Design a protein around this ligand. Structure first.
Ligand SMILES: [Cl-]
Ligand SMILES: [Mg+2]
Ligand SMILES: [Mg+2]
Ligand SMILES: [Mg+2]
Ligand SMILES: [Mg+2]
Ligand SMILES: [Mg+2]
Ligand SMILES: [Mg+2]
Ligand SMILES: [Mg+2]
Ligand SMILES: [Mg+2]
Ligand SMILES: [Mg+2]
Ligand SMILES: [Mg+2]
Lengths: 40, 215, 120, 244
RNA sequence: GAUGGGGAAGCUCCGUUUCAAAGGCCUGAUUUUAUGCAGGCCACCAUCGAAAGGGAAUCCGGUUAAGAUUCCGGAACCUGG
RNA sequence: GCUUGUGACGGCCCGUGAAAAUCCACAGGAAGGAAUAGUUUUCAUGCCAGGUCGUACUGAUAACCGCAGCAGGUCUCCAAG
RNA sequence: UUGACAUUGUGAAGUACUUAUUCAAUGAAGCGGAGCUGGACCACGUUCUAGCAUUCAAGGUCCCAUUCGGGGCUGAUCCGGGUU
């Protein structure tokens, strides 16, 4: 992995080469809803 | 004002990471530090025999300064002025020091005032002096600091200091100090001999005992 | 007041360290170069197989000291024989000596070097 | 005679525990400020098998109060605990399965497991699968708590000792017969070298106190006193009674 | 299997992070010379242990009496700078 | 079809079937930065260097061990009709 | 294994204390006492959710001598240095 370019090792999104798209989607939905519940 | 905002942090249990606080009470000190601190505590927790307990009383700051003021006027000759004298001389007046030297002076009733250090680690060296001075009628004062006594004799430590002869212009000052010093040490030696020191409790044990007595 | 200690762990303090200033020399006479060019290159090897590599392969064969590496062999040949070296291959012979295959650059001919050294 | 089998085990050469595949020592958190005053929330990451242990283990992640990182704790999982569940540990934790509470902050008849004998030893009692501790009394003036142990014994423990609400998972394991020597072999392959066992009466007198004779028999009473020495304690040690 | 420590008349025994003040890489500060001095970071604390476990990177053709994925020709690749 | 590699699955356990070096990504946003000028050596091309030790041969009814050129013993890969 | 003596001290009456000794834990983090605030002697920032939490902390206020920033107090109550 040290010889290849970075474009082969990541995806143009948050948590690109760490978490898949569905898990990133769950993180965002959970973050928004929980913080809204905190205010109320 | 329109850009800066106030965001106080919550430092309760389960909240944000705790800030940096002073933890000097909880420092794991080196072994030698703990031993010298625990040695101080242990000698206070136990009952102290009167012969040792008499050394907890020291001359207070006021007349101790007057005492050292008189003794500083009889400094022993230094090596620098030793050469000048050697290269026909008036009779010298100086402070006598040295444990063996001073003890012999006391036994011959030649010492007029004896200063005793209160922090001699081999305490046996100096523990018998108050009784010896009392027996021989030589006034004595337990003073604070073996390093301070050494300063006026050009030594690191001295552990004892004595005046045997004084100039005629300082006899009045010496006589006044003897009266004050006698009232603090020589006159009260009889009852201090019957008092046991120590027995002090720790901070937490003291509060626990007070709480138990209260309720 | 006292120092504020944010950590409960006590560490050994950093103290000044002085460099050595000896009052007499350790040996007072430095040793000369233990591996000079004459000690690296011991003697050429003139076996018939070695001679074939000279004329054909443009390669000089030498017996070298057991303590010399390829850097020292290349340096020794350049100053002893005023030639450029392409690469050096070495091996330890079954009799306990080291043999080096030294190949010169294209600008030099090994045969002309060999007869100048004295062996043909 | 020679050194008998049970004496040789103390040297610990070939009789040590086989711990290559162990997940780690199963312990509670270290008793800290958050535990003794409030509560701290942890998250169950996974429930995994541990070699040589019948009961499953739970991996619970807590946040470090004093610096920014995560801390990993290995617990013995109780029945009902699942991945993604929040675990609350402390003096003010709720009375729910999987929560860790002091024994003095729970009502009478509570079922607990992984109970501390002393505050801060991180769990000593009721660790095997299907076992639990019943709390049967409180002594607030003496700060003590009376409990019942899986063996049936009654013990008095400090009220500051911690425990986990619920029963250790994996119960009912010993009700299934092993049914053959092969499964016994694999059971102890990951515990220690204590299987198979040779009967003493099948040995020679040099090997065992039960050895020898023209018939296979013990020859003297197998009840051995507590005061006997090593090499003699083979059989029923300090037996109060025998028989069915 | 050293060290710190504790045993043992002693040869030596225990123990491997242990009741220890246990160690060094990013750079700032200096243009007297090379590293004194300033915040912070990190506390993991010897070492040995696999030519079948883990692991950066090479291939084909030709060549000798006996050498080659090691030499020759051609064509590649990795690491450090 | 044979040998071998591999993929998606299924059966089995009171057995659920190593560790570490090492490499990469992300979160974070300390600093560093342009207009007559700077930055990227995770894009392309170009330059230099890569030490030390092993390397022949037998591997067995004759090169190993059994007193020996002993019908014994001694781990493994390739496998045509 | 049992008794005696030594280690071995301190206070009361017909068990109590602490300092020796012993056990255990923590890269010795929040102990003891008091004082605020609340409630009725107790509490005094966290419980629908597999998210997130780090740069002497933002803010408030007091200094430097304005430049790119630095220094106190407060935020985060005092007291005793007995790690628990
Ligand atoms: Cl046996
Ligand atoms: Mg070689
Ligand atoms: Mg038999
Ligand atoms: Mg027998
Ligand atoms: Mg018998
Ligand atoms: Mg050893
Ligand atoms: Mg090694
Ligand atoms: Mg060959
Ligand atoms: Mg070969
Ligand atoms: Mg042989
Ligand atoms: Mg032989």
């Amino acid at each position: 992995y040290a010889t290849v370019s970075k474009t082969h090792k990541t995806v143009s999104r948050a948590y690109g080469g760490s978490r898949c798209a569905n898990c990133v989607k769950e993180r965002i939905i959970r973050a928004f809803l929980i913080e809204e519940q905190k205010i109320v | 004002n329109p850009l800066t905002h106030s965001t106080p942090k919550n430092f309760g249990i389960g909240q944000a990471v705790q800030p940096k606080r002073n933890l000097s009470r909880y420092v794991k000190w080196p072994e030698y530090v703990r031993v010298q601190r625990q040695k101080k505590i242990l000698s206070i927790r136990l009952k102290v025999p009167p012969t040792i307990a008499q050394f907890q009383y020291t001359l207070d700051r006021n007349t101790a300064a007057e005492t050292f003021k008189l003794f500083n006027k009889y400094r022993p000759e230094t090596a620098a002025e030793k050469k000048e004298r050697l290269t026909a001389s008036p009779k010298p007046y100086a402070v006598k020091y040295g444990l063996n030297h001073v003890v012999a002076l006391i036994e011959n009733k030649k010492a007029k005032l004896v200063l005793i250090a209160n922090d001699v680690d081999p305490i046996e060296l100096v523990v018998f002096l108050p009784a010896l001075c009392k027996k021989m009628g030589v006034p004595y004062a337990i003073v604070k600091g073996k390093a301070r006594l050494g300063t006026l004799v050009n030594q690191k430590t001295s552990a004892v200091a004595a005046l045997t002869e004084v100039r005629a212009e300082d006899e009045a000052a010496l006589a006044k100090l003897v009266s004050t010093i006698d009232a603090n040490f020589a006159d009260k030696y009889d009852e201090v001999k019957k008092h046991w020191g120590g027995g002090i409790l720790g901070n937490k044990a003291q509060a626990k005992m007070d709480k138990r007595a209260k309720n | 007041a006292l120092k504020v200690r944010t950590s409960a762990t006590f560490r050994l303090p950093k103290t000044l360290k002085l460099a050595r200033a000896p009052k007499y020399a350790s040996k007072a006479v430095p040793h000369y170069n233990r591996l000079d060019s004459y000690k690296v290159i011991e003697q050429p090897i003139t076996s018939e197989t070695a001679m074939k590599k000279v004329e054909d392969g443009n390669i000089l064969v030498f017996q070298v000291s057991m303590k010399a590496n390829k850097y020292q062999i290349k340096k020794a040949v350049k100053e002893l024989y005023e030639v450029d070296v392409l690469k050096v291959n070495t091996l330890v012979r079954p009799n306990g000596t080291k043999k080096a295959y030294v190949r010169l650059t294209a600008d030099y001919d090994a045969l002309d070097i060999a007869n100048r050294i004295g062996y043909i | 005679g020679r050194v008998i089998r049970n004496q040789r085990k103390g040297a610990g050469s070939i009789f040590t525990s086989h711990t290559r595949l162990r997940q780690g020592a199963a312990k509670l958190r270290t008793l800290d400020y958050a535990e003794r005053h409030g509560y701290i929330r942890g998250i169950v990451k996974q429930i995994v098998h541990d070699s040589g242990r019948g009961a499953p283990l739970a991996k619970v992640v807590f946040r470090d109060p004093y610096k920014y990182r995560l801390r990993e704790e290995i617990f013995i999982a109780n029945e009902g605990v699942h991945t993604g569940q929040f675990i609350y540990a402390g003096k003010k934790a709720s009375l729910n399965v999987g929560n860790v509470l002091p024994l003095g902050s729970v009502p009478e008849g509570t079922i607990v497991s992984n109970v501390e004998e002393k505050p801060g030893d991180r769990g000593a009692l009721a660790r095997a699968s299907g076992n639990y501790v019943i709390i049967i009394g409180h002594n607030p003036d003496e700060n003590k708590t009376r409990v019942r142990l899986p063996s049936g014994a009654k013990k008095v423990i400090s009220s500051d000792a911690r425990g986990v609400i619920g029963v250790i998972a994996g119960g009912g394991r010993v009700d299934k017969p092993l049914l053959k020597a092969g499964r016994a072999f694999h059971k102890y392959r990951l515990k220690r070298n204590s299987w198979p066992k040779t009967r003493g009466v099948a040995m020679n007198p040099v090997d065992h106190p039960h050895g020898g004779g023209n018939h296979q028999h013990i020859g003297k009473a197998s009840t051995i006193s507590r005061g006997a020495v090593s090499g003699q304690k083979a059989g029923l040690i300090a037996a109060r009674r025998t028989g069915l």
